[PDB]
Chain A
Amino acid sequence: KGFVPMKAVTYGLSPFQQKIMPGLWKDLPTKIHHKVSENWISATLLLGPLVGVYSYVQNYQEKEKLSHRY
């Protein structure tokens, strides 16, 4: 149910020997470039068909509004 026989060596430090907070604002320019050069075909597939449909509706409704005016 939960047993896999194994062989490894692990080392570990204490919580009160390390710096807890400063590893968040570490290299935020490098962190941002990694996320957007790897997830730019998943947002071109999420926002793409929505920006292109909203452009069609606003153009359709601006040509039947100027055709009813006398």
Chain B
Amino acid sequence: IDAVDASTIKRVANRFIYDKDIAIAAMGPIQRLPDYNWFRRRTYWNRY
């Protein structure tokens, strides 16, 4: 556990999170929840 430092976090985050596909399931009054292209685009930051 303590062999996981700040550099280990970024390397596993780039393997699993950064610019990857997602899966969504929603239920209820969900007409104001954003759509799939809104969510897929925000898996990366076009600013850094």
Contact = CB atoms under 8 A, between A and B. Distances in A.
Interface of A: 6, 12, 14-16
B7 interface: no
Contacts of B40: 14-15
B21 A6 contact: no
Secondary structure call for the B interface: helix
Nearest to B26: A10
A10 to B, nearest CB: 10
Interface residues on B, range: under 10
Contacts of A12: 36
Which 8 A-B pairs give the minimum distances between C-beta atoms?
A14-B21, A12-B36, A16-B21, A6-B31, A14-B36, A14-B40, A15-B40, A15-B37
